[PDB]
Design a protein around this ligand. Structure first.
Ligand code: A1BON
Ligand code: ZN
Length: 139
């Protein structure tokens, strides 16, 4: 679990969105595994606006933050799960790192701010949904 809190927005994995998130919906995209809802309180996270390919992510299954090198956002095949059929997920970045299903939502960040959140994983791989192109999160 986990979210990004920027301005009056809450960014979460679409597959983990709550009823309150759907009842206060701003934008959602199944192909990216992202959903954004509105908040009453102002958040403290800032979004990175850069092309970094190194950063640090939070891994809840180890209670640790790990440095990682990650690929550029791209269209990647994701196997069927209890949340989606087998499909291509867009704006996804991969890295070598530990992850488990419940790690979704952990923040990936660089020197400029938040880059994205954990969305997929494998045997020693972790995948992040990029948010750097969502310029409207800043206003
Ligand atoms: N974005 C999606 O389509 C995800 C929806 C939730 C399911 N999903 C995953 O990747 C779940 C996952 C599996 C492993 C495993 F192989 F070890 F078991 C590690 C990490 C994760 Cl995040 C895909
Ligand atoms: Zn950066």
């Amino acid at each position: 679990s986990g979210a990004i809190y920027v301005g009056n927005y809450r960014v979460v994995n679409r597959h983990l969105a709550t009823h309150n998130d759907w009842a206060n919906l701003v934008w959602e995209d199944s192909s990216r595994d992202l959903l954004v809802s509105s908040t009453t309180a102002q958040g403290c996270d800032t979004i990175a606006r850069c092309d970094c390919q190194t950063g640090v992510y939070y891994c809840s299954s180890r209670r640790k933050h790990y440095p990682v090198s990650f690929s550029k956002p791209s269209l990647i095949f994701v196997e069927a799960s209890e949340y989606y059929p087998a499909r291509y997920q867009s704006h996804l970045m991969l890295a070598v790192g530990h992850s488990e299903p419940g790690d979704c939502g952990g923040i990936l960040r660089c020197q400029h701010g938040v880059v994205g959140i954990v969305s997929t994983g494998g045997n020693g791989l972790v995948g992040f949904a990029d948010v750097r192109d969502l310029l409207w999160l800043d206003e």
